[PDB]
Chain A
C-alpha cells in the first residue's frame, strides 16, 4: 500500500527520463511512428517513397490538352495560382485525370501519380461541424405544433423518395426558418435531423466568409454541390446574416462581400436544373433582408415562422422540460409559462433553468414552491424587457 503510494509520485519522472525511447516506439516528439497502422501500411508505402509521388503538390486541372515531346500532358493551375504543364506518371491512365477535376502533380518532377479528391478545399467550414447534435429532446417541448409542420417538408422525402414518385407530387425544396434570437430555429432543425437519420452537416456562414471577395464564394459552391451529389443529405444553414444580409451599396461602403456569397447560396439550392431531393433549410436572423430569388417557391415552398413560439408551445416547453427535471408537481407548469410575457422560446426555458438551479442548490430530490416564485417574478420583470424580441419584432 505504502509501496504502491510511492509509485504515484514516481511515475511522472520515470516517463520523462524514458521519453526519447517512448517517442520513437509509440509516437509524438522525436521519431514519430505509431507502430500500429504505419507498420501495416509499410509495404504499400515503399512504392510511394521510391517514386517522385512525394512531393505531390496541390492543384486542380484546367484542361487535359495532350501534346508532343512527352505525349501524356495535362495543363494544371495550382491552388496558389500559377500554371505548369505536367506529365503522366504510369500508375494511372489519361482517363483518370479529367478537365475541371482536382489532381496531384509533383514539385520536383511535375507528373500525376494519383488524382487528388475533388472539392474539399474548405477546412474553415468543417471546424464548426458536428454531425447530429442536440442538447436533449426534453428542452424542445417535445412534439410541438412547430416541430410537426417542419417534419412534412423535411423528413419525409429523405426517408422515402418512393412515396413521392408514387403519388406523383413534386418533391419540396426550401423551408425558411425566421424569428429573432432564441426562438429556436436551430433547436427544431436538430431535432428533425436526428429523427430522419440523414447525414447532417450544419455550418455557420461566417466561416464561408474568409479572406477577400470571391474566396468565400468558392467555398459555398463547392460545399453545396458536394452535399447535392450525396444521396439523403440534410443541410441546416445556421444563422445567416453573414451570407444572407441586405443587397445594396451606397458607394461609401458596400455589402458586396456578403452579397457575393449570399447570391451564390441562393443560386445553388434548386439550381437552373429541375431540383434534387436533397433538402436545404435556411435560418435567418431578419425577414427584412431577403431578396425575391430566395423567396420563389421551388427554392422556398412554404415559409414557416418559428418566431415567438405559439400559444400551445409556451406550455409544452415548460411541461416537457419539467418532466425531465426533478421538480414539484403541485405547481402548474403552464401557470409559470403563461406568466412569461410574449415569450421567446429561450425565455420560457430560462424560468425552468433558474427554478431548477435553486432546487439543485438545496440538493433536494424535487423542488419547492419558493424556487418557482422567485424565478418567475424575476423573469417577468427584467428578462422580457431585455429579450431579443421587443427591438427586433418592430423592425421586422
Chain B
C-alpha cells in the first residue's frame, strides 16, 4: 500500500536527482497546516514537516519534507537530496568537505627517532614538549592546569 500511493512520487524519485541545502528548517504539525477563512473557510496551507530549500543551481524550490527524516534533524549547512523530475526530498545526507580538503587529511610521516636526528638537543625538548605531549601525555598537562 505504501509503495502504491508512493508510486506517482516514485517515478520522479529515481534518477536524475540533484542535491540542495536547507535555507530553513520548519517544524510545525506532521500533516496539514492551518485553515484560512473567507469563501470556503478551509485549508490552503496543507504543509506537514517542510523545508524551504535553495538548490545549488541558483533556483529556490518549496517542498513538504519526508516523514521518514523530518525537518527537525535538518539544519542549515546540511546536504539533502532533491529530485529534478519533481522537487521532493530524495534523501537526507550529512555535511561533508570539498575534494581538496580530502587531500589535506592524514598521510603520516615516518620516524627519524630523537637520537638518530643529529644534534640540536635543547630543541628536541622544545618541540616534543610543545607539540606531542599535550595530545598524547595529556594527563600531565591537566595536572599542571595550563591550557
Residues on A close to B: CB < 8 A? 60-63, 65, 67-70, 73, 75, 77, 82-85, 87, 99-100, 106-111, 272-274
Contacts and interface: CB of A to CB of B under 8 A. Distances in A.
B115 interface: no
Given A83-B56, A85-B81, A69 B91 contact: yes
Interface in B18-37: 18-19
Contact of A69 (B13, B97, B98, B103): B13
Interface residues of B, number: 25
Contact of B96 (A60, A62, A111): A62
B97 A63 contact: yes
B60 interface: no
Given A69-B81, A82-B57, A75 B15 contact: no
B92 to A, nearest CB: 7
A83 B19 contact: yes
Contacts of B50: none
| Max chain A Cβ within 10 angstroms of own Cβ: one of B17, B18, B56 | B17
Main SS class of interface, A: loop
A293 to B, nearest CB: 18
A75 B110 CA distance: 32
B14 to A, nearest CB: 7
B138 interface: no
Nearest to A225: B103
A314 B145 CA distance: 71
Contacts of B107: 273
B77 to A, nearest CB: 13
A100 B15 contact: no
B76 interface: no
Contacts of B109: 272-273
A67 B81 CA distance: 10
A111 B19 contact: no
B93 interface: yes
B3 to A, nearest CB: 13
Given A70-B15, A75-B96, A85 B91 contact: yes
| Max chain A Cβ within 10 angstroms of own Cβ: one of B16, B56, B93, B102 | B16
Contacts of B57: 82
A353 to B, nearest CB: 49
A109 B99 contact: no
| Max chain B Cβ within 10 angstroms of own Cβ: one of A63, A87, A111, A272 | A63
Contacts of B63: none
A100 B79 contact: no
A274 B96 CA distance: 31
B29 to A, nearest CB: 25
B90 interface: yes
B118 interface: no
Nearest to B101: A62
A65 B19 contact: no
B96 A63 contact: yes
Interface in B88-147: 90-94, 96-99, 102-103, 107, 109-110
A99 B106 CA distance: 13
B15 A61 contact: no
Contacts of A70: 14-15
A111 B93 CA distance: 17
B18 A69 contact: no
Contacts of A69: 13, 81, 90-91
B15 A109 contact: yes
Given A68-B91, A75-B93, A85-B81, A108 B98 contact: no
Contact of A65 (B14, B94, B102): B94
A169 B15 CA distance: 58
A69 B66 CA distance: 12
Given A69-B90, A75-B19, A63 B81 contact: no
Contacts of B98: 62, 77
Contacts of B15: 70, 87, 109-111
10 contacts: A73-B91, A75-B79, A77-B98, A84-B19, A99-B102, A100-B102, A106-B16, A107-B16, A109-B15, A272-B109
